[PDB]
Each structure stands twice: as C-alpha cells, then as structure tokens.
C-alpha cells in the first residue's frame, strides 16, 4: 500500500478533487465501477507490454496517420512523377552537428524503405570485406526509426509514407518533409516498464419480469423543502403511457400518499425504462414547473426497483417548455439541500430481474406462434436518405415495421426502423432485439447516430459500439472524440460498453487518451457529470502510465493561468496602460510562476513542447475579457525547420465551446471536399475548452485581419497580396485567396455564424483566407458578405466589373462545395445532436439544428436546392449572384 500512497496523490491533482471523495460513496454501482473497470485497465496494460520495447513506444507515440492510404487524384498530381522529395537529417558528431540527405522516393514507401535509402546515402560504394556482411546488413534490420523535425511524432508503424498527416500536409502545402533519423535505443531508453499497480479497493427467488402480469404502480410518500407532482414513464424522449399526476395539494403540505397507477404493463417495461418526476405549481390555466428528477426503473444489475427511495430534484434550466423534463440525468441531486421527494415502489415479495436474452428470444417465438413488389421497396430507400430530423409520419412508421424483415437489405435504415417500434410492447421489443442481434454492420459515422438521446436501449447501443471497435479508425476516433465523450452522459449506468470501449482505446493510444482527459476535466465544473467523469478519470490515471507525470504539469500550468486572469479581471483592471503591463510582467517574472510554464507538453497538441518563455512578446489583448497572448520556444534540436514561437491565446471570460464544434466541422468539411476533388484549403486551427470558460487558442504565424491591412481607406487588400507575392507567385496567391474564400463562405452559410466583419476575417501573407471567433453560430436572434475588396482580389485586378471569368468560376466552386456538404447532411446533423447535452446556449433544442436543414434545403431536390443557394446569395449580395 506504500506505492498507492504516492500514485493516489498525483491522480487527485489532475482530476481536481481528492480520491477519498470516491471511497466514501455508499452507492454500490460506484464501488462496482471502480472494481470492475480495472479489467479494462489490465487488458490494456497487458496489451502495451506484449512486445517489450515497441508496444510501449507505439502507445506513447502512435502513428498520426490518415484513415485511408488511397490518395486523391489531385493530391497525387502534386507529386513529381508520383514521387516525393523527402529530407533525411542525421546527427553524426557528438557536438550536435547536422547533415541533411535529400532523396527522391515513391510516396507509398514504408519507413523501412526510406531508412534503407538513407543507408545508401551514407555508404555509396564503401568498404566491405567478405567477413563484414552482417556488420553492414544489420543496418538494414530493425535498428533505426524516423521522426518529424520539430515535433514529437514518430514513424513507428509500417504505414505508407503518404498516410502520415505530416507528409500528407507537406504534399498539400508543397513543402519539404524534413525527417530526423534516430535509433531504436534513442527512443526506447526514455520509456520505463510500468508494472500494473492495482489499488487497495481491487479486492475479491429472483424471478423474471415477464411473469409478473400486473400494472405498474408507484407511490409518492412525502417531500421536503397549490402544487402537485408530474410523473411519467419514458424511454429516452418518447413516453410509454399518458402522464399520470397526483392531486393538487396546497403548498407547505408535502404529503400525498398516492399510488400513481400507470397505463403500462409491468412485463412491457423495456430495459431502458425511465421514470420522470417534476413538481408543478398551480396559481385560464397556471402550470409552471420548478424542480424535476429522473430515476431509471432498472438499476445496473438488471433488477426492478422496489422499496422506498429518496430522490433529490434538480433545478429547471433557463428555457424549459413542458412541465415534465424527459431528457433527465437518471440520478439524484448530490446537493443534500434541494427539495427531496420520497417515493415507494411495488414490492412483489421477490427480486424482479429483467430477463436475459435467452428468455427474450424464447418469448420472441411466442409472438409468431400466438398468431414484396418493387414499387414498395424503393420507398424505404427514400426514407434512409432523409436527415435524422426529418419527421417520420405515422403512415411511414407502420411501413418500416411491416417490412422489418426486409430492412436487412438496406442496413442504413436501421435508425429509421428503431423509431417505428412501440417500445412499450413486450412483443415488439423482443422481435427488435433479435433483428439487432444479427444486423449487418454499418458505417462508424452512421453508428454514432444510435448513441445519442434518441436510442437509450442497451441492445441498440451495444450494436453501435461493436460497429466502432470493428470499423472506426483511430484517426476518425480522435476526430469524433468530442461527440463520443459527450454521449457518455446519455448512458444510464456507469459501467457500459461505450465506456469500456473509449477507455481501452484511450489506454492504448496516448494521442487519443490526451484529449480523452481534457474533455473530461473541462466538465468538472458541473456536478451533474462530475461523479461519472471523476470515476472515469480515476480509472484512466490509474493505468495511463508515465504520461500522468506530464499530464499533471499541464494542469498546474493551466491553473497558474486561470488565477492570473481572475486577478486581472476581478481585481485591478481600472487602468489599461501601465497596470495592464505592471502586474502582468511581475507575475511572469516571478520565480514560482516561471517554472510552472517550462518544459511541459502543449494541451492543444501533445507533440508540441512548450519550453522557454519569451516575455518580450507576451502581452494582454484589448479584446473581450482581455485574453492573454502567450509565446514559447520549441526546445527541439530541429526547431529551425518547424515553427519557433508557440503562440497560444488564453481566453478567460468568453466560452470556447462554440469554437471547438465549429473548428471541428470545418476540418470535417475540408476532408469531404479534399476527398471529392475540391481543393478548398480550410484553416481549422486548434482550440480546446478548459474547465468553466477558459481555453486555449492556437495562433497561426504571419496572419493579419482585414482591418490590419490598410494605408484614409482604400482597396489595398489586392496591393498587400501583390507586395508580398511577386513574380509568378502572385498568380498562385490569388488562387489561394479564392479557394479558401469559397470554402469559408459556403461553410458559414450552412452554419449561420454571426455577422462577420473585418476583424472576424484574417488573411496570411501566403494569401489564405480564414475566419475566427465563432462565438455565435446557428443564431437567429449572410455572415460572409462579398465586399468590394474581395472581388478586387478574386476577379483578378478588374477595378470596375467584378463579374468576369474569375468570378464565374468562383460560383462553380461554391456550388460543388454546397452540394457536397448537402450529400453528407446526415453526418453533420448527427454531430450536432450528440452535442445537445453539452448545455451550449445555441445547442439547447432541436429548433437550432433544424436551421441546418433549411440552409441546406433538405426538403427540395438537387436542382431546387441549388437555386435556393443562388437566391440567398443574390439577396445577401444585392445583384451579386445572378442566375
């Protein structure tokens, strides 16, 4: 127990709360979670230690690669005859001397082949005696590795060189892939053998539900702290029976003693059956809720609830419509000071347990034992192509249910079929279980739709997880990690398949595990998810290995930035000339604060090392909440080839959760375009929300806003691109200005970002256009207006007529990009529905995500949706986008 006294200390630092707050939890599910989840840790640490040196190095440095080795046609054409010019750097002298070795090689070469070519660049025709074969053949064996110059990424896996994002990005940008050569011992000697240290708490009638044959009856006894109680049985968001409420008793008399008789049959309660409670006040009609609570009818051991229970209710949000809140948390309030409603459930004089699959498939026979034309099958295909928010009429409900045995031909209609099942029927829930058991596999992006709030059934969610661990790559997983972490709240239990999946994968890929921690620590300021994420972060830190040491340095570093911004906002802040640069430079030069920001991995990117500070550029911005513009050094020995000033914006006041979702969709929109031929270079800079409202923003060097470029006012934007890109580079910089503009214009119209002005739009000296500060999206209370300065640059240099051949092709880029996103409308809408539980201001109800359906014209055909965009573009730009 002496080693556990040391590990438990640093674990509580990263979580933000001591570990003892979980050992004193009387909940049996909490203790069983911490006990059984260690099986996921044991299976993970034993997977990281199969091979002695490489398995640990592969974990800490996973190959950041693309999802498919197949290169797009226009990306392959960027290569010289299908070959890439890579630069191999080798250190020879012990005094840190550099020697480059350029070589042309095929793009689809494994790292072992480029190493062997660098061997030829070091030998040529050298010395070899007939006893010196294995002396030099050992060079061609497993002896050397490869590393990106400037970053901490390693080419450890035998994937093609094009798959790696760094090499892939060098092909896009047209840059030299500089790779430093190392040996296996140079990297393996920095990773110890962490033996699995299990904690101290890792020690070693009952009839079925379908034999009860009674009516569900729940009694409310009393309460603490004219009103009544709204009680409802729900399965996610759909109700099973009519909302049964109690008598309207007066205030200050929290007594009822009424067995609420529900219309649901006890053997018909699904596995994910939930009870929804709320208190409404009566003062025409006067009905307004105040407090609400949610309890699942079955606990984590598949047993029916029985006996008395004390439920602590939750405060209603800012905007709640219905009296009862079905989208609850399935838990009691741990505030111990809010109104506590007491209940009493039915007894049955036995432990009623939900039946296993054996009885479910056995009773599935009793449903059939108790007693195809082509024009019909084409309609089911037209239903799967509709967005997940398209209202399925009742006539379409029975169409999919009467043809449930045919839907195996089109497995993409499964999310549509699940909404066509009366889950309040013990016969339909048994037949649907057998269909999901043998359902064909679907795409990982389509399986995520079955993990949101609309599909709370464990058999449905278990299918989606089995479609991820068999078809979801680590690239798309790190891409969709924010939405996958977000849907953990929709799980009604602590230990489940989705948690065991995201834990084992995060414990086997440290690049995934890094963002797996910060996306969970950023939710600790909310107690409704603190217990679930606290137990999950405890299990992660218990077996995350050596990275716990580096992870605690980032927490201490980030915490040293939150308090300073609080002292600069709550205190002082009176004068912004010397006071803005007095206390600011005094804390950054303080000894105890300097070492807090020295030699720790960047939270925005674990491969970036934030080394020495450069206080000469560190300042406080004059924007909202006065962010902190910070600057670091790159302690990499090859820092000359990559960036040298790691610049990060620390936004304290404003919430940075709206930016992450926008900066992520822009990356997803860019990948969809690059995979179809649209070379619209988007700039999705890094952004990570921390804690309550603080967060980090990745800064791009040599970037200036539209207002930053001026010399009175004039159209000097075209001159700035002329002055910085002379010769034949001007023709390429103007093209970069048009392709990035068409992307950042057709994307903001689909998102609906706030009114973009000259400070929202920034341009680089290279000529790339990109937007920033996505604080308001999907808003309604157009954003990218084609100003005069844009057409002066887009339409060559025509100072008068802007509608020329250059602008004529600008519309065609937007049309191909608009229709491309429309073809993937189901993917983006699913990404917004998985973020509804994040409590974002513009992501509260489905009326906001429906704004995507209208801006994409998902109710019209392909050509009719094209004229919609041309109409709205010609309306925003008065006479700009004529037919």
């Amino acid at each position: 127990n002496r080693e556990e006294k040391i590990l438990n200390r640093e674990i509580g630092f990263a979580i933000g709360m001591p570990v003892c707050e979980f050992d004193m939890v009387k909940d049996p599910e909490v203790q069983d979670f911490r006990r059984n989840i260690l099986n996921v840790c044991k299976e993970a640490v034993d997977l990281r230690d199969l091979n002695s040196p490489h398995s640990r190095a592969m974990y800490v440095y996973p190959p950041n690669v693309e999802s498919s080795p197949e290169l797009p046609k226009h990306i392959y054409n960027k290569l010289d005859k299908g070959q890439i010019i890579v630069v191999i750097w080798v250190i020879v002298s012990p005094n840190n001397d550099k020697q480059k070795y350029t070589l042309k090689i095929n793009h689809d070469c494994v790292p072992e082949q480029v190493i062997a070519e660098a061997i030829r660049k070091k030998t040529r025709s050298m010395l070899l005696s007939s006893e010196q074969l294995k002396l030099c053949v050992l060079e061609y064996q497993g002896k050397y590795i490869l590393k990106v110059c400037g970053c901490d990424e390693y080419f450890l896996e035998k994937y093609p060189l094009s798959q790696y994002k760094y090499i892939r990005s060098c092909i896009m940008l047209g840059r030299m892939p500089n790779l430093m050569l190392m040996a296996k011992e140079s990297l393996y000697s920095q990773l110890p053998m962490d033996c699995f240290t299990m904690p101290s708490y890792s020690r070693r009638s009952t009839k079925s539900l379908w034999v009860i044959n009674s009516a569900l009856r729940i009694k409310i006894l009393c309460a603490t702290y004219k009103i009544y109680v709204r009680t409802g049985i729900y399965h996610g968001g759909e109700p099973l029976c009519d909302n049964v409420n109690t008598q309207r008793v007066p205030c200050s008399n929290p007594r009822w003693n009424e067995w609420l008789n529900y219309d649901i049959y006890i053997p018909d309660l699904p596995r994910a059956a939930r009870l929804c409670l709320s208190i409404c006040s009566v003062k025409k009609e006067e009905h307004c809720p105040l407090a609400w609570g949610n309890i699942n009818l079955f606990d984590y051991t598949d047993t029916l609830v029985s006996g008395k229970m004390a439920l602590n209710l939750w405060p209603v949000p800012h905007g709640l419509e219905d009296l009862l809140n079905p989208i609850g948390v399935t838990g009691s309030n741990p505030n111990k000071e809010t109104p506590c409603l007491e209940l009493e459930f039915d007894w049955f004089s036995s432990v009623v347990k939900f039946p296993d699959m054996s009885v479910i498939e056995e009773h599935a026979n009793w449903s059939v034992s108790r007693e195809l034309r082509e024009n019909d099958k084409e309609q089911l295909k037209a239903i799967s192509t509709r967005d997940p928010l398209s209202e399925i009429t009742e006539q379409e409900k029975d169409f999919l249910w009467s043809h449930r045995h045919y839907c195996v031909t089109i497995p993409e209609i499964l999310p549509k079929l699940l909404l066509s099942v009366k889950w309040n029927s013990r016969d339909e829930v048994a037949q649907m279980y057998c269909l999901v058991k043998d359902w064909p596999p679907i795409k990982p992006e389509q399986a995520m739709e079955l993990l949101d709030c609309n599909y709370p059934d464990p058999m449905v969610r278990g299918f989606a997880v089995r479609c991820l661990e068999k078809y979801l790559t680590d690239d798309k997983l790190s891409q969709y990690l924010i939405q996958l972490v977000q849907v953990l709240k929709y799980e009604q239990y602590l230990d489940n398949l989705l948690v065991r999946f995201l834990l084992k994968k995060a414990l086997t890929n440290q690049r995934i595990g890094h963002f797996f921690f910060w996306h969970l620590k950023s939710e600790m300021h909310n107690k409704t998810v603190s217990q679930r994420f606290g137990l999950l972060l405890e299990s992660y830190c218990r077996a995350c290995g050596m990275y716990l040491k580096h992870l605690n340095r980032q927490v201490e570093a980030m915490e040293k930035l939150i308090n300073l911004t609080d002292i600069l906002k709550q205190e002082k802040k009176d004068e912004t000339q010397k006071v803005q640069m007095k206390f600011l430079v005094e804390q950054m030069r303080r000894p105890d604060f300097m070492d807090a920001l020295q030699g720790f991995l960047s939270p925005l990117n674990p491969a970036h090392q934030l080394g020495n500070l450069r206080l000469e550029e560190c300042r406080i911005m004059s924007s909202a909440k006065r962010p902190l513009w910070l600057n670091w050094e790159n302690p990499d020995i090859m820092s000359e080839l990559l960036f040298q000033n790691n610049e990060i914006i620390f936004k304290n006041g404003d919430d940075l959760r709206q930016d992450m979702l926008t900066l992520q969709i822009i990356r997803i929109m860019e990948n969809i375009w690059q995979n179809q031929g649209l070379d619209l270079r988007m700039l999705p800079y890094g952004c990570l929300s921390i804690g309550d409202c603080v967060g980090l923003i990745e800064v791009v060097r040599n970037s200036h806003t539209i207002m930053q470029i001026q010399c009175f006012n004039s159209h000097t934007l075209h001159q700035w691109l002329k002055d910085k890109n002379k010769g034949e580079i001007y023709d390429a910089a103007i093209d970069l200005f048009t392709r990035s503009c068409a992307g950042y214009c057709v994307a903001t119209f689909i998102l609906g970002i706030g009114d973009r002005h000259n400070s929202n739009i920034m341009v680089k000296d290279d000529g790339q256009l990109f937007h920033i500060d996505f604080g308001h999206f999907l808003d309604h209370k157009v954003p990218f207006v084609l100003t005069q300065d844009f057409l002066i640059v887009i339409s060559k240099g025509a100072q008068e007529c802007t509608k020329t051949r250059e602008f004529e092709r600008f519309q065609e880029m937007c049309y191909k990009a608009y229709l491309a996103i429309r073809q993937h409308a189901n993917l983006f809408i699913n990404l917004f529905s998985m973020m509804l539980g994040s409590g974002m201001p513009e992501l509260q109800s489905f009326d906001d995500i429906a704004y995507i359906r209208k801006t994409l014209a998902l109710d019209k055909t392909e050509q009719e949706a094209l004229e919609y965009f041309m109409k709205q573009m010609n309306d925003a730009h008065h006479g700009g986008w004529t037919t």
Partner: protein, 168 residues
Amino acid sequence: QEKYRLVVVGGGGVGKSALTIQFIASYFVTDYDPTIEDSYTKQCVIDDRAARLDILDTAGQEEFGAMREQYMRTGEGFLLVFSVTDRGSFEEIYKFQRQILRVKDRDEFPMILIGNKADLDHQRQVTQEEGQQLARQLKVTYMEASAKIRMNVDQAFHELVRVIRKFQ
C-alpha cells in the same frame, strides 16, 4: 564559432560528390549517385583560427534548378567546379557565376574555380590554359583537382575560406 557555409555548385557528373566526401571521409567514390542536396560538416583548424565548415553538395541535373535560388542566399562560399573531360560543364560554369552575383546583388563574392578529373589526361578536353582564362574572366582563382588521387582537395576548401575572410 566561425560560420562558413561552403557550397559546391557545378554541372552533372563533374565530381562535386566525389570531391565533397573526399574532404571529410577522405575516400574516393566510384558510383554515380545523382545528388539533390546533401550537407556535410567538418571542423578544420588549417586556417589561422577555427572553422565551422558547412558543406553543401548541390545538384546538377537542371531539374532541381529551383533549389539554386535558395542556397545561393545562405552560403558565403562557392566552388565553381567542372570536369576537364567535359567541355559542356566548362561552357556552363559562368551561368552559376551569374546567378550567385545576381542573387546577392554584389560585384564579387568568394568563389574558387575548380577543374576536376585532372587525372584523366587521356580524355581531357579543356586544357589548363583555358582554365585560367575563365579565372581572369570571372575574376576568381583557378585550381585544378582530382578526387581519384586527392589532389588539391583540402586546398580547394581552404583557399575558399581564405577569400571569405579577405572579403569583409
């Protein structure tokens, strides 16, 4: 310490690669590996002080000519080398001498005209008198060399670092 980025420019197959590795590895090579851009470093004390010689073996395939405009901005010492057995390289040396002065916008710059493959006298097409002819024309110093016998290999790079100090 003593920054000296030496650059070896010239045509194809004139001996830039054989002369470069002869200065460090001190072994003559016989393969024809078309160089693109390789870097070599060697600490020398033959000069009156120390020297951090950063040697760059450049390409001569004319397909990497876009890389010429790069190392001609960072290097402070060049070696216009050609093969006495190849008049094609001899009549293309001045093109390298014009691009260097055009990039830096200077009247002169430390560079030494090297005539390689001098051991192949039975196949020499550019005699010695034509070598010093281009020396006075380009206002540089002429020096024949031969990587096969290691003739004036150290003197070629050492006389280059002597013009850098006498430049100023």
